[PDB]
Write a protein that binds this ligand. Structure first.
Ligand SMILES: Nc1ncnc2c1ncn2[C@@H]1O[C@H](COP(=O)(O)OP(=O)(O)OP(=O)(O)O)[C@@H](O)[C@H]1O
Ligand SMILES: Nc1ncnc2c1ncn2[C@@H]1O[C@H](COP(=O)(O)OP(=O)(O)OP(=O)(O)O)[C@@H](O)[C@H]1O
Ligand SMILES: Nc1ncnc2c1ncn2[C@@H]1O[C@H](COP(=O)(O)OP(=O)(O)O)[C@@H](O)[C@H]1O
Lengths: 547, 48, 286, 533
């Protein structure tokens, strides 16, 4: 069976980028004669597994009508060194006489892994035979080779040079409208019921790839078999072949299929965005229009911001009283410009084994180039000072393993790549001066004490994940603390909600759960630490250098 | 006033023992091996 | 093996200078050897430099009481090896200097070894220490084996104010590590092979707080005080760096030498090191 | 279908060497000496990848019609052990059928790496086979082999010998006219428009190479094809501006070797110290006879001290223009940020590279670590405590005095520094950088206001009269603090003097007053206590 354009979905914007890149050297070679530059020959697809990259290669080959040939990954390594090089030479010879042709290879990570970690004999055998055959061929036969893997920097870095493999293409996860199109192709033969809604299952699975959606409906259809298992047993060899027409996979079987399955490709963070607005936290309006003057002005007017010779405002910081909404603002800083964003933290991503501690920051630099735009943000800058190191005396420095890869490439990228580093610390007196320099953190965004008289509006958008009592008591819940922000306000909520497991085998939420919760009204963020930095908010211009 | 200790690990070998291409055996058959002393091998003629 | 290449390295530049009709350029010049020495790849530069320098005794002025004492300790065993075997007593191995940092007590020791073509190894006191724990005693005896294999060599221990000051004064945690690093060289002074012409030469400031087990005979017994040189022996210092002067001075240089005794043996050497700021500056504008 | 001399550019000074280093044996063995012929074949070219090492080797081969035989390191290393021994003999047997020929050998660092990690028979077999045939071709067969790698320190030093490998050719990044020259080469058939630029994007490419130029012209032309279909073709400058924001910087972990052209009039004032530096170093680089006619030595290290960060980097940039040489920018806190081994081997791996790139100059900063990191005996730090003081006394005097490598140094507080190594002769030109004058910083501010338009009703001397603690770099935030309001009023509703009051006092202050009286404590005694202080 052959596939076409309708058999794939979700990556319709991504497929159109691969469409014009491969159909121009195949169909119309007259643009090469007019502009006088060589069109590319080797593309490379990558991303999470189970996104149908092998299905997209068969779709672009049959619709264009070119001579398609497939070279799978592990079938080359199942042979020895002798016959594998002869089979690779035979594939390129038949595609030359059948021009135009597409020589699609698959699973280049098994053939070309990272060579420097295992300096071996076979790790430079089949790839050196391929490299003298890929760069060595020249007959103007306008053939295209397509590669596929699961990680762009897992392959040997010599393959990503000019003339061999230049255009990198990322295959991302589909959206809500994209994952709806995947199940519609698989359910063409599945006799579903009338109560099954099409758009309801798209919002159910948030981070499921197309391989996970196709395994979800088959498990739900298998539950329809075990639901009708007591109706007709398996001892009769398809004797009662008249009740099988009443086999409809109704929608709660998909609810049971979601209850047993698990997300497979969600072992990392989100790749697209986060959506929590500035109105989800209460107040802080004195910095809302202030941050609109520094991060969304240059991306909307790239000419008037740079023709005056001013540097791009790449880095801001959040400082003030410790633990007072800046940890709550860790996710609510990406929805203003609505760009791509991945949060980094000390014990989260840079505290892994050796060799992978710098590859995570390499992905945000591929997001600066191949998946632009990007937003970088690092929180809790005083905990990272233990890993960076403190400079002592007059001759010091931050001898850290990760700051060499950070500070060099964060300044080499221009304003067109849309790099944006965001800082958020808890105390400015616990900041290493070796990382701070004029040109990186010249934008001062002071975070004050988070509005203890108006903190009732903070907890109003915090108790919206649970059905609560309509007769709420919000008189003096957070105005008597003055050191308990929205992060530590959960402990007051945990006081008024841990009693649900008690007094059981009825009332669930009463007014006494919030009225008697003021007996632990303490203050962890005292006023002695706030007033040191309230005067620093108007005098940091005279201390914007070393400290 | 401290130390750094790390061990190692090895993998020895695997083998296949593949040999004897067919073109060497076809040349291996058409030869001689020697004949003691007086073990002539003869000629013959006929069919006038 | 390098000398076989330097004749060819300057011959090709003679062909490159032009491009008997073309063979008259084959006669090499004395500056093309300097061009071959200008882009020279020295064989001693490919590894550590342990060659003998071409310094002599005429480059300095004064310090002649040290010179007559340093002509018997390390030269008489190697020039007349049968004299000390007649009496069966080997000569003393070790000479100690002490004084101000202005005189040439660490700089004239190179002329002692290079006279009889001996190797020179200069180690500094606060250069190698015990960073981790015990990482200094293995780095002391690691040079004693090659000091006698490539003999004649000497070893020049310098600035002993980081080791020879702590005997019973420092009682801290660093003082406990100080007691572990000073007995390595104290046992190696009498445990070394004294028949392989290996010598120690010391020159250390602050001669009052020296360790008492190093001023004993056999290790450092030549108590030679090295002050600044005499005020009449300061004109003979300037014979090395400059020789060509069209006015021939030498009475004004001794006038400022005899003015005060506080002038150092290196500060009066710098009155001709400032010639590029005094005389060569206003004489090259032509 | 071949290439020539016009198809490559940028590389000119050592290309003029290599156009005569191999042509002199190949064109005529008779006219070399005609008595004893000594051809030093075995040229070793090295440099970063993408510099066109193979293309510049085929330029001299196709010019003289030489047969360009090509092999590579890993393509013959990954074969069988007995097969690589025969195939190397099958490669060198072409020296008699195509003489005068050229044998190109690449990736010898994979063939002959450093001999510390391995002790083996098969690991030394592939390098002893080429030793046994290097003297086999000593019958003057008129062939010259070419060895191409990344760096000479990766090759085993027994290969580099007088008779086998002595010729060394360094291939680095091109200058501002060099990448301009390869931009003309790769656009010989590019049908562009009249609005394209040739000089702005050329000087902007710092860590780029001609192979990266080849990806720049193809990616910019591909963007032009995308918005045409959706003869009717035309390539504007904005396609190359899209390639500027989509470029791929590869050469980033290397110090800059390129020379600059910034004049001394870019900075204002301090004219008394530019003539003192011009009377010391730019005279012996043209003729060193002034130091030998009276028996003197050139300077080893200079110093700068005063207010920190007041524009000493651009002063270190401008010293490579009056001397007509290159410039090496080594960072300040790299003496402490580099670990054990990295603080010793990396600071001398650029020094012998500076000897190959002579004449040049090296810049160092934060020289106040000699008086605080001398007694290194703690069991926590590695090369940041004791592995700096043990080598700066040796590596500063470990020069050759024949290629004139120079060190530029700069510190902040010289009162705590010991005068033991600070005597003249080695550390001789210790300089106090003062506070800049009123005409000095406005000459810098005239260059800072060059990049932006400004009305002529603005004056800069009204803020210069009250500069008690404001240097030239302290007033660099005036174009950031005052000019932040000129962007908001122009882009919200679909350069003047109104924002001069918001940057009048609260712009930037870095120079304090406690160390300001300390900056003249040594400067008043620079004429009497010049030796020690
Ligand atoms: N348009 C589409 N987009 C994404 N997934 C799809 C689409 N159409 C079908 N699918 C489902 O996704 C799967 C495609 O995955 P595929 O077979 O390409 O695995 P892969 O890991 O990408 O291949 P490879 O092993 O070459 O990496 C199919 O099993 C199919 O059910
Ligand atoms: N000095 C130069 N540096 C880089 N590229 C150049 C230079 N001069 C010309 N080019 C052109 O740019 C391209 C750069 O690719 P090229 O393969 O020459 O780089 P390379 O590093 O020599 O390759 P390899 O690493 O395979 O030897 C060449 O195709 C060449 O035509
Ligand atoms: N006789 C001398 N008179 C003046 N200066 C000298 C003399 N001998 C050596 N020097 C200078 O002293 C240096 C060598 O000794 P020095 O460094 O002073 O040792 P120390 O500092 O340990 O006393 C040389 O650089 C040289 O210029």
């Amino acid at each position: 069976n052959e596939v076409g354009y309708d058999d794939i979905g979700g990556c319709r914007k991504q497929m159109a980028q691969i469409r014009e890149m491969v159909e121009l050297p195949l169909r119309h070679p007259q643009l090469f004669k007019a502009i006088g530059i060589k069109p590319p020959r080797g593309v490379l697809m990558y991303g999470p597994p189970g996104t149908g990259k092998t299905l997209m290669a068969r779709a672009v080959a049959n619709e264009t009508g070119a001579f398609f040939f497939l070279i799978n990954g592990p079938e080359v390594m199942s042979k020895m060194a002798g016959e594998s090089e002869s089979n690779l030479r035979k594939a390129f010879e038949e595609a030359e006489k059948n021009a135009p042709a597409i020589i699609f290879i698959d699973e280049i990570d098994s053939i070309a892994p990272k060579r420097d970690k295992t300096n071996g004999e076979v790790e430079r055998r089949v790839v050196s035979q391929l490299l003298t055959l890929m760069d060595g061929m020249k007959a103007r036969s306008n053939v295209v080779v397509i590669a596929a893997t699961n990680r762009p920097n897992s392959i040997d870095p010599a393959l990503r040079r000019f003339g061999r493999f230049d255009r990198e293409v990322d295959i991302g996860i589909p959206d809500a409208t994209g994952r709806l199109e995947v199940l519609r192709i698989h359910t063409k033969n599945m006799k579903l019921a009338d109560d099954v809604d099409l758009e309801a299952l798209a919002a159910e699975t948030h981070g499921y790839v197309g391989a996970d959606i196709a395994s979800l409906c088959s498990e739900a259809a298998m539950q329809q078999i075990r639901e009708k298992m007591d109706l007709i047993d398996l001892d009769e060899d398809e004797i009662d072949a008249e009740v099988l027409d009443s086999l409809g996979v109704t929608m709660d079987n998909f609810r049971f299929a979601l209850g047993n399955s698990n997300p497979s490709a969600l072992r990392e963070t989100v790749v697209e965005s986060v959506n929590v607005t500035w109105d989800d936290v209460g107040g802080l309006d004195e910095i809302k229009e202030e941050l609109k003057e520094t991060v969304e002005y240059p991306v909307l007017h790239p000419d008037q911001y740079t023709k005056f010779g001013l540097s791009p405002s790449k880095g801001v910081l959040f400082y003030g009283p410790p633990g007072t909404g800046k940890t709550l603002l860790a996710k609510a800083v990406a929805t203003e410009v609505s760009a791509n964003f991945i949060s980094v933290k000390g014990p989260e991503l840079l505290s892994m084994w050796y060799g992978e501690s710098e590859s995570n920051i390499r992905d945000i630099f591929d997001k600066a180039r191949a998946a632009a735009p990007t937003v970088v943000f690092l929180d809790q800058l005083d905990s990272i000072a233990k890993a960076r190191g403190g400079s002592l005396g007059d001759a010091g420095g931050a001898s850290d393993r990760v700051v060499n890869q950070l500070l060099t490439e964060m300044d080499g990228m221009n304003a067109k790549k849309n790099v944006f580093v965001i800082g958020a610390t808890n105390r400015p007196d616990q900041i290493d001066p070796a990382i701070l320099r004029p040109g990186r953190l010249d934008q001062l965004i002071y975070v004050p004490l988070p509005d203890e008289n108006a903190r009732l509006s903070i907890l109003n958008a915090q108790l919206r994940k649970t059905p609560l009592e309509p007769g709420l008591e919000l008189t003096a819940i957070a105005k008597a603390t003055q050191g308990f922000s929205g992060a530590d306000l959960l402990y007051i909520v945990q006081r008024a909600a841990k009693y649900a497991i008690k007094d059981s085998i009825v009332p669930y939420i009463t007014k006494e759960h919030f009225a008697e919760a003021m007996k632990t009204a303490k203050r962890s963020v005292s006023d002695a630490e706030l007033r040191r930095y309230e005067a620093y908010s108007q005098q940091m211009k005279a201390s914007r250098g070393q400290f | 006033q401290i130390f750094v200790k790390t061990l190692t690990g090895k993998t020895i070998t695997l083998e296949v023992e593949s040999s004897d291409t067919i073109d060497n055996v076809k040349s291996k058959i058409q030869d001689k091996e020697g004949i003691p002393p007086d073990q002539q091998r003869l000629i013959f003629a006929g069919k006038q | 093996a390098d000398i076989a290449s330097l004749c060819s390295e300057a011959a090709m530049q003679q062909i490159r200078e032009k491009m008997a009709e073309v063979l008259d350029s084959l006669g090499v010049t004395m500056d093309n050897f300097r061009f071959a020495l200008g882009n020279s790849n020295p064989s001693a530069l490919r590894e550590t430099v342990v060659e003998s320098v071409n310094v002599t005794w005429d480059d300095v002025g004064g310090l002649d009481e040290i010179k007559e004492e340093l002509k018997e300790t390390v030269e008489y065993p190697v020039l007349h090896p049968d004299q000390y075997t007649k009496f069966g007593l080997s000569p003393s191995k070790g000479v100690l200097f002490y004084g101000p940092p202005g005189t040439g007590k660490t700089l004239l020791a190179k002329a002692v070894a290079t006279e009889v073509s001996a190797n020179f190894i200069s180690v500094k006191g606060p250069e190698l220490l015990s960073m981790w724990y015990g990482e200094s005693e293995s780095n002391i005896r690691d040079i004693f084996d090659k000091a006698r294999a490539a003999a004649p060599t000497v070893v020049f221990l310098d600035q002993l104010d980081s080791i020879a000051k702590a005997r019973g004064g420092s009682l801290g945690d660093a003082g406990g590590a100080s007691d572990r690093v000073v007995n390595q060289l104290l046992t190696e002074m009498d445990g070394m092979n004294a028949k392989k012409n290996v010598f120690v030469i010391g020159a250390t400031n602050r001669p009052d707080q020296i360790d008492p087990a190093i001023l004993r005979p056999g290790r450092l017994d030549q108590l030679i005080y090295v002050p600044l040189p005499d005020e009449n022996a300061r004109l003979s210092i300037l014979n090395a760096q400059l020789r060509k002067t069209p006015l021939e001075p030498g009475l004004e240089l001794t006038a400022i030498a005899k003015a005060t005794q506080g002038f150092s043996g290196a500060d009066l050497l710098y009155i001709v090191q400032r010639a590029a700021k005094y005389a060569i500056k206003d004489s090259i504008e032509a």
